[PDB]
Every structure is written in C-alpha cells, then in structure tokens.
Design an enzyme around this catalytic site. Sequence first.
Site, mmCIF file in Angstrom:
data_model
loop_
_atom_site.group_PDB
_atom_site.id
_atom_site.type_symbol
_atom_site.label_atom_id
_atom_site.label_comp_id
_atom_site.label_asym_id
_atom_site.label_seq_id
_atom_site.Cartn_x
_atom_site.Cartn_y
_atom_site.Cartn_z
ATOM 1 N N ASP A 15 9.005 12.162 40.075
ATOM 2 C CA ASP A 15 9.958 12.204 41.208
ATOM 3 C C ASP A 15 9.380 11.768 42.553
ATOM 4 O O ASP A 15 9.987 12.059 43.595
ATOM 5 C CB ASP A 15 10.593 13.612 41.331
ATOM 6 C CG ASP A 15 9.552 14.709 41.448
ATOM 7 O OD1 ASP A 15 8.417 14.414 41.903
ATOM 8 O OD2 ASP A 15 9.878 15.866 41.118
ATOM 9 N N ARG A 29 10.151 11.135 47.985
ATOM 10 C CA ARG A 29 10.420 12.224 47.027
ATOM 11 C C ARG A 29 11.922 12.207 46.731
ATOM 12 O O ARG A 29 12.725 12.123 47.651
ATOM 13 C CB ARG A 29 10.035 13.573 47.712
ATOM 14 C CG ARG A 29 10.330 14.861 46.909
ATOM 15 C CD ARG A 29 9.695 14.869 45.534
ATOM 16 N NE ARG A 29 9.751 16.198 44.895
ATOM 17 C CZ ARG A 29 10.804 16.649 44.219
ATOM 18 N NH1 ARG A 29 11.866 15.867 44.002
ATOM 19 N NH2 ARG A 29 10.736 17.867 43.648
ATOM 20 N N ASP A 34 13.756 17.929 40.149
ATOM 21 C CA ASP A 34 12.381 18.378 39.964
ATOM 22 C C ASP A 34 11.949 17.927 38.592
ATOM 23 O O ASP A 34 12.486 18.384 37.582
ATOM 24 C CB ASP A 34 12.328 19.911 40.113
ATOM 25 C CG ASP A 34 10.897 20.468 40.187
ATOM 26 O OD1 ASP A 34 10.017 19.786 40.688
ATOM 27 O OD2 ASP A 34 10.724 21.663 39.881
ATOM 28 N N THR A 35 11.002 17.001 38.551
ATOM 29 C CA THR A 35 10.362 16.646 37.303
ATOM 30 C C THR A 35 9.156 17.572 37.077
ATOM 31 O O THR A 35 8.576 18.035 38.027
ATOM 32 C CB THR A 35 9.901 15.156 37.305
ATOM 33 O OG1 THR A 35 9.093 14.857 38.450
ATOM 34 C CG2 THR A 35 11.127 14.207 37.310
ATOM 35 N N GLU A 37 5.274 18.524 36.482
ATOM 36 C CA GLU A 37 4.093 17.856 37.030
ATOM 37 C C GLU A 37 3.425 17.152 35.849
ATOM 38 O O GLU A 37 3.745 17.451 34.686
ATOM 39 C CB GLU A 37 3.146 18.852 37.731
ATOM 40 C CG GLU A 37 3.781 19.694 38.866
ATOM 41 C CD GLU A 37 4.128 18.884 40.129
ATOM 42 O OE1 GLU A 37 3.386 17.928 40.464
ATOM 43 O OE2 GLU A 37 5.133 19.218 40.809
ATOM 44 N N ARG A 75 6.971 12.932 53.383
ATOM 45 C CA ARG A 75 7.640 12.116 52.344
ATOM 46 C C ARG A 75 9.084 11.795 52.727
ATOM 47 O O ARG A 75 9.822 12.677 53.206
ATOM 48 C CB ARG A 75 7.616 12.820 50.961
ATOM 49 C CG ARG A 75 6.199 13.284 50.558
ATOM 50 C CD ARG A 75 6.165 13.898 49.205
ATOM 51 N NE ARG A 75 6.905 15.165 49.219
ATOM 52 C CZ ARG A 75 6.994 15.992 48.181
ATOM 53 N NH1 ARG A 75 6.353 15.724 47.039
ATOM 54 N NH2 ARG A 75 7.842 17.018 48.246
HETATM 55 C C1 THP Z 1 13.005 17.697 47.092
HETATM 56 C C2 THP Z 1 12.584 18.421 48.353
HETATM 57 C C3 THP Z 1 11.360 19.044 48.403
HETATM 58 N N1 THP Z 1 10.982 19.669 49.566
HETATM 59 C C4 THP Z 1 9.728 20.452 49.589
HETATM 60 C C5 THP Z 1 10.048 21.837 49.004
HETATM 61 C C6 THP Z 1 8.755 22.273 48.291
HETATM 62 O O1 THP Z 1 7.918 22.905 49.295
HETATM 63 P P1 THP Z 1 6.561 23.546 48.659
HETATM 64 O O2 THP Z 1 5.476 22.526 48.533
HETATM 65 O O3 THP Z 1 6.102 24.589 49.763
HETATM 66 O O4 THP Z 1 6.742 24.193 47.238
HETATM 67 C C7 THP Z 1 8.165 20.898 47.840
HETATM 68 C C8 THP Z 1 8.435 20.602 46.365
HETATM 69 O O5 THP Z 1 8.153 19.217 46.202
HETATM 70 P P2 THP Z 1 7.388 18.867 44.837
HETATM 71 O O6 THP Z 1 8.287 19.229 43.677
HETATM 72 O O7 THP Z 1 7.076 17.314 44.905
HETATM 73 O O8 THP Z 1 6.011 19.636 44.675
HETATM 74 O O9 THP Z 1 8.813 19.902 48.655
HETATM 75 C C9 THP Z 1 11.792 19.670 50.654
HETATM 76 O O10 THP Z 1 11.464 20.291 51.682
HETATM 77 N N2 THP Z 1 12.987 19.040 50.635
HETATM 78 C C10 THP Z 1 13.404 18.403 49.496
HETATM 79 O O11 THP Z 1 14.498 17.870 49.494
HETATM 80 CA CA CA Z 2 7.885 17.871 40.855
#
Ligand code: THP
Ligand code: CA
EC number: 3.1.31.1
Length: 129
Positions: A15, A29, A34-35, A37, A75
Amino acid sequence: LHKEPATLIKAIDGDTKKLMYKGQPMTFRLLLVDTPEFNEKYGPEASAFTKKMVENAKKIEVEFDKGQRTDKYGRGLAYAYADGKMVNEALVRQGLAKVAYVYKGNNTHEQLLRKAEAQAKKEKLNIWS
Ligand SMILES: Cc1cn([C@H]2C[C@H](OP(=O)(O)O)[C@@H](COP(=O)(O)O)O2)c(=O)[nH]c1=O
Ligand SMILES: [Ca+2]
C-alpha cells in the site's frame, strides 16, 4: 475528485509506492486500505500485486480526497490508478487488503471499497481464506 498525473519511481510494498508528482519524488500511502506488512502473511503477495499493477501500467494517476493530502510521515494520501483501474479497490477486491483507516473527510470511496471487501470475503480470497 480529480485524477492527476504521476509517474512510477519505485514500487515499495502493498500500500505504499514512490511516485513523481508535480515533478517531485514523494512516497504515496493508499487511502482507506491496509495491506499486511512484507513480514506478515499475504504481505509478499500484496507487495507483488501492487508492484505488478503499477509497473505494467502505461499511465499512473493519483486522486486526492477532500481532506488531508499528506499524513504525519509526509506521505501523500491518494487513490492510485493504473491505466484507469484503482489500485486501492483492486487490492481489496482480491483480499490482499482490508478496508482500514477510514477518517472523516477523506472517505469518498469508502462504500465502493467495502463492496469489494464483501465480495472478496464472500469468495474467501487470500486474507479471507
Ligand atoms: C492510510 C492512513 C494512514 N495514516 C497513518 C495512521 C497510522 O499511524 P501510526 O504509524 O501511528 O500507526 C499509519 C499507518 O500507516 P501504515 O499502515 O503504512 O503503517 O499511517 C494516516 O494518518 N492517514 C491515513 O489515511
Ligand atoms: Ca500496511
């Protein structure tokens, strides 16, 4: 919502990907998904699916939603299209992502993606197997 041009710089994982957007490199992103890891079950398969979809595409586009366009990591948050087909939806329809991270005001395609998840789950695909 509006599709804008971008070009692939490098696949990263299921993702996230590095794209050139308005001539600047950015990590993107995918909204609303959510894919797993790479280290996790179906993680490799999600990464491969997205890599193939974006690398094979003649035309990549990004579509921002109504809300925040970058997350706290810098991102880009977007729906990504490969030759007109949404990557976000395609991952969910194949059971290689779950609908996730649905925040108010960046959720234009929520119902579209939940419909795809229901079908992937009905078909017991991948994550839903
Ligand atoms: C998809 C998405 C993720 N995020 C943040 C939430 C999560 O914070 P945390 O890192 O504190 O868990 C993280 C998850 O992305 P990833 O799934 O790439 O790890 O990205 C956003 O803020 N907005 C979004 O739309
Ligand atoms: Ca992910």
